[model samples]
Target chain A: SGFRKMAFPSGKVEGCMVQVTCGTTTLNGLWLDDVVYCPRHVICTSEDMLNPNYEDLLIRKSNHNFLVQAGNVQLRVIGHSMQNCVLKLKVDTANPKTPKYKFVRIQPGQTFSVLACYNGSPSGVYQCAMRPNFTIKGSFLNGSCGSVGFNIDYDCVSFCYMHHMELPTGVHAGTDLEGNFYGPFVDRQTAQAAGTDTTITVNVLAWLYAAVINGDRWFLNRFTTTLNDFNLVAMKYNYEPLTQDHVDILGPLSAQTGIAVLDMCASLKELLQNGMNGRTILGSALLEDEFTPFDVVRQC
Target chain B: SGFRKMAFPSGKVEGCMVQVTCGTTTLNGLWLDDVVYCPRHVICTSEDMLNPNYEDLLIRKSNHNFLVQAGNVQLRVIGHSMQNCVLKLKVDTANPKTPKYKFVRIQPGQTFSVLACYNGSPSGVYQCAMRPNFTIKGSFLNGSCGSVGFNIDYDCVSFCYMHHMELPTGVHAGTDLEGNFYGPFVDRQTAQAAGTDTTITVNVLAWLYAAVINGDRWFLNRFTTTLNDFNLVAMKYNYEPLTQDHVDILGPLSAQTGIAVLDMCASLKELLQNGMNGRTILGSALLEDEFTPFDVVRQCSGVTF
Candidate 1:
């Protein structure tokens, strides 16, 4: 006769929609004539939930007894008469940032974007929000699903945004932080960015930072000097140099992130030399400039 | 008594040595009795004259008739009696500068001296004069006898003197003007000159002229720049640079003479780089300097540019 008696209008109720809090959010919960009805959150217990298509189906309540087939699925209930009345629902009490798949396969030379937050179920038609604001380009195997929390196999994978200008052609392979192997991706196949601007400046800085941290000063010097001249000529051709935006994007630099960046650059340079015959977007002018400085160093 | 009577103490004489002019040189000629004697030069007709030993045997006069068997031999007589009084002699009416043998063979890596004037017989122990004042070092086949006229086979041959410092090691082959193949010489084996001075300076200039005439500007630049630095360092170490002596030796420049010089330098450079690991007399210092200038030109000249 306490809050329970005061909360209900009568002793027996049929087919009622009651407001209940599922975790932090409010949801329409089912109610019936009860023998001490109470809300209980539990794991799912459906084989269908294990399928990729059931990623959004969090909870399922029914008046009929159902077998829980998949370990990944969870179940919940709110009534004592399991067969007569039941309230089945699902809520994401777990962390939203957790990855759904441990490993994803990506094809070679494919480009994709990664987002920080995603709405709705991973298996369902959901909108991605706050995407990293850059395109990730690389060939990857056993890759993560960014922040979307889904198991997706992509043709190519990348950890950071890559500018189209710096992307070279031909398939190449690299390992992830976890040491999982990926690709032999055809470079620059899907990388179609227009003109040299703030984006490329940031990308080049990232590459430089990566090279510096990896203790590859030779590569650093060569690439920096090459791009410096390239950018100088590009400036005359209506382009600009590194700006404040690049500084902001790079933020802090450390050796811990160097390996992946170095890997990307290594493969990029190889492809540029081997597959493209050392030809850049600016053609032989940039190539000629590259030789001058390198030659000076070699002579000395 | 005509001129013949006044020229001789006419009588039935035995063996006698008489002074007579044989070409430009004075030689002792044998005088025999009566028979209206007059010096008559004739081609040799003996196979013995063709042998290498006959190079110094210029004259063979006797009162005996001998069978002439070799085409290269010559005969001369002073009397009409072909059998009883015969004077077989040879004077070089042919040019002294002309080579004795059409082809001589010099062994690989052998050093020699080519002289403008060689005295006496090519088949005998004759002394070479002036010797071009230098040593010629190379491997040659079907080569020419210098000024001394003889058919000889040497282990190595050279057309001009080479300083020991610039010579490289290993056997290498080259072609002559007539497209005859020579060598695979072990360079520098016989090139043993001491210290750098006017001699090397002259030799180096000769090499430069040869390269310049060959239309090989790249080689010229590389070799000249290399030696310039090398000579600079050498000067610090009590050595000297190119002087008037070198200019005098080089004489004049023309493309006609470039082929042989270029061939020598080409083989020399190849031996230096391949056989010796690019090491020179001054060790890595000279090689290092060579790399600097060559690398500079190559960067601009290569496809990488």
Candidate 2:
């Protein structure tokens, strides 16, 4: 399956780096997702992603044995890999100096236990490097580009919005359903005469992508859950009513599903440029100009 | 008796001329207040504000008699007039065409019902003007400026804190409030340390001034009742608590008293330049360059005294 967004704020996971380890082997540069785009138009499966024209790479799993420690490092493959090889992670205890260093082969559907070495180095820092080639993009995936980060978890389980600050309820509501105030307003007289009405529908996924890269958690929290009498206890604070259109795109939150996390900064930028029909012309110009203050939590 | 600054809402009321009128009698340039300061520290008795050493200028009260005008034009004295004669005002009936146009002389601490003239100009617009030698400044009180936008009452009392859009709670809470995160945060470390320590003590009077002259109802709604509970209640949703020093400066709100209003824009300026030991340094250079947005709300701030 493609890498979907993740829910956040239920824990202290913002700006946190996750570590994956097996008995004596550990994997580096391993994350649940990255700054890339994978369309959810078609729910992908490990079998669907199987690739014949794929290549493999050689990478070192540093701190193999998780050197100098004793504990479990949680490891799990998040998205489908459209590449050829099964991801095999292990600590090569064969040789220390001339270690059989080679990148592990990862397949579209693979989950392997990672390990670390505690006997390798003392007063040391763990490091890993890749010498071969391996790609995370789907064989059919394409290009994209990517904000204060926020996350929305929804695929087949439940939908929720998470952030560290309070978001205006009037802003972002349910999936693909938020009010837009970007363009100019129609004159009262002309609008009344012409009977012209318009609504702006923003792309939730695109907006989320913008937020995460920017580290804007505030904007991300603006997400509203679904419209139902249930999940009153599960829904975070208050959520917007879910429309049938959202259900068509997001599907339902249940069964082997993944989350779709996003950044709040992207939403903030979208809001500023598009929210409230030009209130920025009044006093937000200064805020828009000052960008670094908003990037305090940006990912390295 | 304090240096009360009035509201203008960035409109042109900063130096506007007000006209008062009775039925047939119209008085021009009769406002007792100006952008200039008048020290109420020494409240003048009606007699003390009167000056015989003052000269009188002749002017007209448009309608010498109350005409068919329905409604009322409430006019009264606002501040002192150190350079006054007898503070005389009446609908002079003698003036049909420069018969006898005597300007109504006003002394400080005086309030007289103003009249409008329907007989002179039909569906007329009222007008007022200062005589050549008459000055609104106090010969006795000097070097002070003030505003009418500030209020002394609670519910119907004063006006404060107006913005065109909803400001993020973080940006407006406590004193040193707001982070650039447009919305909420991750909990605990990302959040607790994130919501951060915010301060919302605003320049109440300044905000009130900005609201009144601008006639911005949205801003007036932003006012908190008592200084203490008001600040506490109105502090942004995720804002950090008030510091001991700020509490000491603000004191508690009780009885008929309201929170002493201060300036949010002033604090904002302070924050942009110096808060968080330089958090502004991150994304502030651009804001500093494009400065008009926030400054639009700043009072002639820096009034520590």
Candidate 3:
């Protein structure tokens, strides 16, 4: 017979069935009153087993791969007597790789990188990632979420690197670097001792973003000091100029975070004026300056 | 030369005189210029020596009598230099007897007798004397001063005598006497023991007056007890009655002194009534009764006469 009555816990032989083809046999058969029945040709798929229009059949099987092609899918089972039945299913699939770029909501405690890829650049490009995947490059544009191509929005970002010069022993240059000066330092002391270029690098963007996230006045003050040191060295020797790329990245970040890009002379003048007035600046003494040499490009 | 110049300390001779008769002599002679001049006679009497118009002559005489017949006389002696001089004179006279009676002022602490003379009488006569002089008799009248003769005002008085019966030993007849019962007493217990009349006498007026003067309620209460005893005895036997003389003397004394002559019955009633009301009489408990048998005549009250 093609259709067989299912003996459910309801004690009624209805509302449930199993199909067995002729010439098929079940590994386990049902025996009643000295007659044996086999279901070797039982053809109920998982879909038919889960269909609620009839009493659900309990399937005990393993080693299956369910490829879910759609975003949403639902499977359910119903019992004739509403009593619980044992159904065992196992599925195996490969783990999907984490996306390289995502639209990260701007909040505290997010880590980002200022370098364009796994490499460095001065194009205002940054990489937004929590972990390494594919490398992409893009400008650090003014937006809520970060992007590399014009269309793809990556919600993660990273701190920027700050460049400075290293000196030999007993030779001190630049403003006194105090407090949290950017993030991690790329020491160039070995090159300076070898009589080569002694340029040091730091993750300036991540340091400032971390400070801004915590409202750290001390870090903000150190940022001003780093900017002044850059301005001074650029004026004295053949040094890398701060182009529009640096200004563009910093301008929006400072504007949105309320971290002012201060001028050296103007901040000193203000400190002097406040001192004469018998007033003291408590936190973040540096104020935004309209024209700062650190933000100006060379005329040529 | 009937007159001799008297040499005085004033060194003047015209004012004083010393008369010398032809054959009189002076016991003492005046001395001048180491010679003594003796006058056989000098006739200056004491009156002439005392006259003020002339400087006095000094006289030394003794044992003379100057019977001064007038009620008032003046004698003066003037000295020539007003310097003191000795002028001795002496006069002898007999002592006069004190008057028999004189009017006395009624006051506290004065002593008087209830009987008219030194003896006794039923008449309300009293003897007013501080000391013994002479004796007289008369009825005692209600006047300021005591007198036997109506016109003679003996301005003094004496206390009355209260008479009560006495008994033999162990026979207490009269009221039990306590406190100051009148004044001095006359004990008749000797006669009573001899089976004769036994009447005791006391200076009742002086006692009552002394109590009145001192405002002694205790003595006044004793006086009432004595009166009640006399009243009871007079009712029981042939006792001497209290006469008009006794009542008359006592009426003015009591009226003027405010000593109430109280009846025994009325005083007891008052004492009972006051006790009922929880009120107490402090001083004398006696109150004056309008119709008292003690003031009745025949009808007698107070001590005998």
On DockQ, the leading prediction is: 2
Instruction: List TM-score per model, in order.
Output: 0.17, 0.18, 0.15
lDDT of each: 0.24, 0.21, 0.22
Compose the digit string of candidate 3's lDDT tens values, residues B39-132.
1112233344233222323333211211111112211211111111212111122112112222222221122332211111111212222111
Over B1-305, each residue of candidate 2 has an lDDT whose tens digit, in order, gives: 10111111111111122233333223222122221111121122234334311222122222232121112332333322321111222222211112111122332111111111111111101111111111111100011111111111211212111100111321210000011111232111122222332322222222233333233222222333334543454354322233344334333221113323333323433333343342222122212211111121322221100
Calculate DockQ per candidate and list them: 0.00, 0.01, 0.00
Q: Quick one: how many clashes does candidate 3 have?
A: 31
- The weakest ten consecutive residues by lDDT in model 2 chain A span A138-147
Model 3: docking quality category: incorrect
lDDT of 3 by residue, A189-227 (tens): 233321222111111332333334333443223325455
After superposing candidate 3 on the true structure, give the runs of residues whose Cα lies further than 4 Å from its correct spot. Answer: A1-300, B1-202, B219-230, B234-240, B262-305
Arranged by lDDT with the best first, the candidates are 1, 3, 2
Residue A252 of model 3, lDDT score:
52
Model 1 in CAPRI terms: which quality?
Answer: incorrect
Better lDDT candidate (1, 3): 1
Clashes of each: 36, 106, 31
